Design a protein around this ligand. Structure first.
Ligand SMILES: CCCCCCCC/C=C\CCCCCCCC(=O)O[C@@H](COC(=O)CCCCCCCCCCCCCCC)COP(=O)([O-])OCC[N+](C)(C)C
Ligand SMILES: CCCCCCCC/C=C\CCCCCCCC(=O)O[C@@H](COC(=O)CCCCCCCCCCCCCCC)COP(=O)([O-])OCC[N+](C)(C)C
Ligand SMILES: CCCCCCCC/C=C\CCCCCCCC(=O)O[C@@H](COC(=O)CCCCCCCCCCCCCCC)COP(=O)([O-])OCC[N+](C)(C)C
Ligand SMILES: CCCCCCCC/C=C\CCCCCCCC(=O)O[C@@H](COC(=O)CCCCCCCCCCCCCCC)COP(=O)([O-])OCC[N+](C)(C)C
Ligand SMILES: CCCCCCCC/C=C\CCCCCCCC(=O)O[C@@H](COC(=O)CCCCCCCCCCCCCCC)COP(=O)([O-])OCC[N+](C)(C)C
Ligand SMILES: CCCCCCCC/C=C\CCCCCCCC(=O)O[C@@H](COC(=O)CCCCCCCCCCCCCCC)COP(=O)([O-])OCC[N+](C)(C)C
Ligand SMILES: CCCCCCCC/C=C\CCCCCCCC(=O)O[C@@H](COC(=O)CCCCCCCCCCCCCCC)COP(=O)([O-])OCC[N+](C)(C)C
Ligand SMILES: CCCCCCCC/C=C\CCCCCCCC(=O)O[C@@H](COC(=O)CCCCCCCCCCCCCCC)COP(=O)([O-])OCC[N+](C)(C)C
Ligand SMILES: CCCCCCCC/C=C\CCCCCCCC(=O)O[C@@H](COC(=O)CCCCCCCCCCCCCCC)COP(=O)([O-])OCC[N+](C)(C)C
Ligand SMILES: CCCCCCCC/C=C\CCCCCCCC(=O)O[C@@H](COC(=O)CCCCCCCCCCCCCCC)COP(=O)([O-])OCC[N+](C)(C)C
Ligand SMILES: CC(C)=CCC/C(C)=C\C=O
Ligand SMILES: CC(C)=CCC/C(C)=C\C=O
Lengths: 612, 211, 114, 70
């Protein structure tokens, strides 16, 4: 049948294939040859010969080119596609490049091929980064995603390459290289090298400024995908060669031995436009790589300068105003009778103010914030509950009810628990204040579940173990109910109570047995609390404490920018040069660094002599 | 030799055999792992679990799991035809048979709790849900308590002490019920321990959660 | 003895005051809450509720922290259960705060030992 | 290494024990393939496992099915 072609091409028998290829042309006497196709997939002879790369395959492709040109079938032969799910548009060039074959790929390119074929398949478009292989839907980003630079060089030298072509997902070559840079331990660093090579050969500012279908750029895509290596390369990209210096971002202003001034270009990194690089790399809880990605110079020094410029004055003022509000709430109920009347409105209009600002920011956030453990979302819950309790208690006090010391007492009970949140301003106190939340959210509830189970099991046992008093003694056995037994057992746990043998029971020794084994089990359970502490802190010491705190501080600085108006945004960066490059350069930032190891002669500095 | 390497803890030979791929002709039938396809980084391998899956007596997975005499079970179970087999089995039928068992035991334990504390000193159906279930445990555990090798008790954790605890709990329940019915009045002596130990068995069902 | 006598000063100057600040904040917040939570006695009972003043409530809470006092439910209040709720959550918060003392110890000694 | 590795062994033992508490008609959840195509003899079962590697670079010629697709 037609399977004789498929078996022949997979074994490399050139003589056996040419034995019948000379008579298949005369078999049909002349025309959409369905023999070299597939109703399920859509294969061709030339395309199939390239998947099973056998050591004698150049002659097969050569005789296939001769067969293609002699029967005038190259349009539907060298440029074909599949017609089933997950595969569309996989031409011959999309596999010859894939099999690390350069000579056959160059032969197909010399025949014309497709070059800009869009392999728009569902396997090529996986839902996540593990169920499929997304390379860029073109036989140019396929060679760039792989480690083949020679095929990229000969492809970009073609007159029909169209390097600025857009993938059907809206991506580009730089977007495709960004999406596949998983890490350095499992991928090395060739992705950055291919990014630099393709960017240099493009030689213009249209690949980096191309907007994705998600409204993103390769810089912003690398920021949102956690690609710290590519982000570090782009933000610190310096090109000393002429005609390509406009593509660089970091410009060395001057250098005098160890000290040198670098003028980073934060024209898209600073939070001056919607969805900047800093805003994306801070407001993205779906990536864990935010730990080391925020440490880059145009981000780290930007956050430091912002904190030392306006965030400090807006954090101290907020803390002191909240402290005054909390102490006013404290001495308005304890000193309240059962002029200093102004203290009853400072807690009322401020509760309304919190109800407004928090009440609108409580829900204007992505659900992924609640997916993590610490994303500044639980504190929104606590502040909203405190404000709601204050206003509800005030309204209860005014109109009808008398619960003004039931829901209000909790107002300072939770309000004075919110002063711990404002410790993020101190480095040391902020370091101490992070595992307070972490240990509760991870380890304490683990013991709480087992301790509640032990309390429930022993509570119903000891309550039923007593002799039910005939009401001769009113407060009989001190374990009359399940709640009383639970209270007594918890009191015994914290070492405050009584362990009297005579508890007015039918079996005193069994009650004693249960009490002793409860103490032993509680002691073991409490020991495992320190054990779980050992299991979690000692691996990521100095990395789960202050690194997340720095992320919280950066988020606080970014949040403080939103609570100021347009006229207050006059604290932008420096330069406004329009001198480093021909186009209107927007902003720049100066960073100094001293190094006593590298020794070189610098020739690519910007300003001839130093001086800030 | 595959089962011998599984029972002797030879993790290196087991890894070689279970991932044995031969690309040469006339010798490809001796291989076990067959690469179905490969497209760059992603590739599909068709492992041959014709003797590894638990479809016959003393399979490779059953041997490498039910062998407490080897300590090398720690890293030997991490091989692909074993690790992915256990993951798929857990996500196919073991999850539904673990949640159902935990919820049924939770209902049994809470029924036992509010049948003695609320007992006078219709809701009468709670006195038989603890009786026929105690008989059921007495049967299934009562036959599996002794059908095991003595080497299980040689180790520290081999799912053998929990058999003791469950058997003691069921025995205490039935003995207390029979004491309550016929002659004695110790229905709050050996029974109070029934929920004292029964609520200590809910800790065992925490194996479903990773944390 | 000189080796033992150096971290006596170091731990006080670094870690103890960290917990002292938070414990004082917790004492102040719970002290004003529990003092106001009681029912103000009409002087029928002279030493009423044992939590009459803010200072008395602070003293009783610190006594409960070191495991010496009383955890009686009936404290002559309008809401006994709310007083019980605040006492229980105070003990839980104090336990977490005390656990973080050993945690801070882990964060500083184990890197620069000897 | 002494916390979750033994727990994984306990989980595997629990899965193996759950297989014994079901009857013959419920053992219809076997693996896939039933090929008798990879080799001349009657091949019984097979299991598909996928893996991504960004380090090794080679030309593969010994794959089973010519084009991919599950
Ligand atoms: C209880 C916890 C309290 C936490 C307060 C945090 C806070 O806002 O202080 C901060 C702000 O404070 C300052 O730096 C000083 C005041 C600066 C602004 C002055 C008013 C300007 C008004 C204009 C109209 C302190 O932050 P920090 O100075 O970066 O802290 C250093 C860290 N260390 C102390 C561990 C070395
Ligand atoms: C016209 C010009 C400005 C008006 C801008 C909008 C109104 C201000 C809203 C902020 C406010 O009132 O509370 C802020 C006070 O803010 C200050 O202390 C500002 C100085 C407090 O903000 P925060 O300290 O960030 O609050 C912590 C809780 N949160 C982070 C969950 C929100
Ligand atoms: C009521 C809890 C919600 C607390 C806030 C949300 C965090 C939940 C997850 C968490 O870290 O909990 C931990 C404590 O383990 C528990 O989930 C608690 C112990 C069991 C319940 C006890 C109830 C008493 C479990 O840790 P994890 O399962 O590794 O956490 C997943 C991590 N993630 C949430 C970032 C995906
Ligand atoms: C999760 C934990 C749930 C705890 C529920 C009990 C909380 C404490 C409580 O109010 O107990 C009370 C209810 O008694 C019970 O509800 C007993 C429950 C036993 C199990 C204790 O009160 P009691 O006098 O034991 O109530 C008798 C119940 N009866 C009137 C319905 C017959
Ligand atoms: C070192 C270790 C430190 C701890 C380690 C951590 C472990 C921590 C576990 C702590 C568990 C404590 C359980 C106490 C239950 C209790 O006393 O019940 C009482 C009710 O009390 C309530 O109504 C309690 C309400 C919830 C308390 C706060 C839970 C916070 C969990 C987050 C029953 O008493 P009563 O109702 O007064 O009975 C008489 C009825 N009367 C009112 C009609 C007269
Ligand atoms: C006290 C301790 C309780 C422990 C319960 C364990 C249990 O059985 O739950 C398990 C089953 O549960 C599920 O995965 C959800 C229910 C699935 C079956 C639904 C009924 C099917 C009935 C059909 C007729 C949960 O196991 P897990 O989902 O693998 O746990 C993830 C681990 N993590 C939570 C730490 C991330
Ligand atoms: C005809 C078709 C089936 C009958 C098969 C034999 C009878 C069932 C025996 C199992 C049983 O009743 O208890 C099981 C309930 O099982 C379920 O929840 C099944 C759903 C409980 O099994 P387990 O959760 O493994 O029990 C833990 C204790 N052990 C591991 C020490 C045994
Ligand atoms: C009343 C304190 C003065 C004690 C003697 C002087 C030492 C102060 C600094 C110190 O080591 O304190 C530590 C305890 O953190 C605190 O500063 C205390 C916690 C906050 C205040 C609590 C008050 C109750 C903070 O550590 P640090 O900020 O890393 O210390 C800076 C180091 N230096 C002082 C050598 C520069
Ligand atoms: C830093 C910590 C500061 C603590 C201040 C109180 C210390 C204790 C103390 O002397 O309290 C005393 C003052 O009562 C108060 O001063 C209450 C303060 C509530 C806040 C307790 O005495 P008193 O009988 O509550 O005093 C009534 C106050 N009055 C006469 C002014 C109306
Ligand atoms: C394990 C954990 C261990 C600890 C961990 C570390 C935590 C430590 C925190 C310790 C805080 C203790 C606060 C006690 C306050 C108190 O009792 O107030 C009392 C006053 O008492 C004073 O006047 C106290 C003066 C300062 C005490 C020393 C502080 C040292 C801080 C360095 C109020 O009582 P009174 O005034 O008698 O009231 C009746 C009025 N009369 C006198 C008119 C009759
Ligand atoms: C978590 C921190 C530093 C403050 C919040 C205190 C609280 C309100 C409950 C405690 O976890
Ligand atoms: C050991 C675990 C998790 C549960 C069993 C509890 C018990 C019944 C005695 C305690 O060792």
């Amino acid at each position: 049948l037609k399977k004789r072609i498929f078996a022949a091409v997979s074994e490399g028998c050139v003589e056996e294939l040419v034995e019948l290829l000379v008579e298949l042309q005369e078999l049909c006497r002349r025309f959409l040859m369905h023999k070299l196709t597939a109703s399920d997939t859509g294969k061709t002879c030339l395309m199939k010969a390239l998947l099973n790369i056998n050591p004698n395959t150049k002659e097969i492709v050569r005789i296939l080119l001769a067969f293609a040109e002699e029967n005038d079938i190259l349009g539907r032969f060298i440029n074909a596609e599949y017609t089933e799910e997950a595969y569309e548009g996989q031409t011959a060039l999309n596999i010859a490049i894939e099999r690390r074959q350069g000579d056959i790929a160059a032969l197909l390119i010399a025949a014309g091929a497709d070059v800009n074929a869009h392999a728009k398949g569902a396997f090529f478009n996986p839902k996540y980064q593990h169920e499929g292989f997304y390379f860029g839907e073109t036989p140019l980003a396929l060679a760039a995603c792989t480690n083949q630079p020679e095929i990229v060089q000969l492809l970009m030298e073609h007159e029909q390459t169209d390097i600025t072509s857009r993938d059907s997902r809206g991506n580009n070559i730089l977007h495709a290289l960004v999406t596949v840079a998983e890490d350095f331990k499992t991928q090395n660093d060739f992705v950055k090298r291919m990014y630099d090579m393709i960017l240099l050969r493009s030689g213009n500012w249209e690949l980096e400024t191309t907007r994705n279908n998600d409204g993103l750029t390769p810089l912003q895509l690398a920021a949102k995908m956690g690609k710290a290596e590519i982000l570090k390369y782009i933000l610190s990209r310096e090109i000393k060669e002429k005609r390509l210096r406009s593509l660089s971002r970091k410009f060395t202003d001057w250098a005098y031995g160890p000290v040198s001034s670098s003028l980073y270009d934060l024209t898209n990194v600073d939070t001056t436009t919607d969805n900047s690089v800093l805003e994306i790399t801070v407001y993205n809880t779906n990536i864990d790589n935010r730990h080391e990605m925020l440490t880059l110079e145009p981000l780290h020094t930007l956050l430091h300068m912002k904190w030392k410029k306006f965030a400090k004055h807006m954090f101290f003022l907020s803390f002191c105003f909240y402290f005054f509000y909390n102490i006013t709430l404290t001495l308005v109920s304890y000193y309240r009778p059962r002029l200093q009347l102004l203290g009853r409105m400072f807690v009322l209009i401020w509760a309304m103010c919190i109800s407004v600002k928090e009440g609108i920011a409580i829900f204007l956030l992505r659900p992924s914030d609640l997916q993590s453990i610490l994303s500044d979302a639980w504190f929104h819950f606590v502040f909203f509950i405190q404000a709601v309790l204050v206003i509800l208690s005030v309204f209860l006090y005014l109109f009808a009810y008398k619960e003004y010391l039931a829901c209000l007492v909790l107002a300072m009970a939770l309000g004075w628990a919110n002063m711990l949140y404002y410790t993020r301003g101190f480095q040391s106190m902020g370091m101490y204040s992070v595992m307070i939340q972490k240990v509760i959210l991870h380890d304490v509830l683990k013991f709480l579940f087992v301790y509640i189970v032990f309390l429930l099991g022993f509570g119903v046992a000891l309550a039923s173990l007593i002799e039910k008093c005939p009401k001769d003694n009113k407060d009989c056995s001190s374990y009359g109910s399940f709640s009383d037994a639970v209270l007594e057992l918890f009191k015994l746990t914290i070492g405050l109570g009584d362990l009297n043998i005579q508890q007015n029971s039918k079996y005193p020794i069994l009650f004693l047995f249960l009490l002793i084994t409860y103490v032993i089990l509680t002691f073991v359970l409490l020991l495992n609390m320190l054990i779980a502490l050992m299991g979690e802190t000692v691996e990521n010491v100095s990395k789960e404490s202050e690194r997340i705190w720095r992320l919280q501080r950066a988020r606080t600085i970014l949040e403080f920018e939103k609570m100021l108006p347009e006229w207050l945004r006059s604290r932008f960066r420096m330069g406004e040069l329009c001198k480093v490059a021909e186009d209107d350069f927007r902003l720049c930032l100066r960073i100094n660094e001293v190094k006593w190891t590298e020794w070189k002669t610098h020739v690519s500095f910007l300003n001839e002599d130093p001086g800030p």
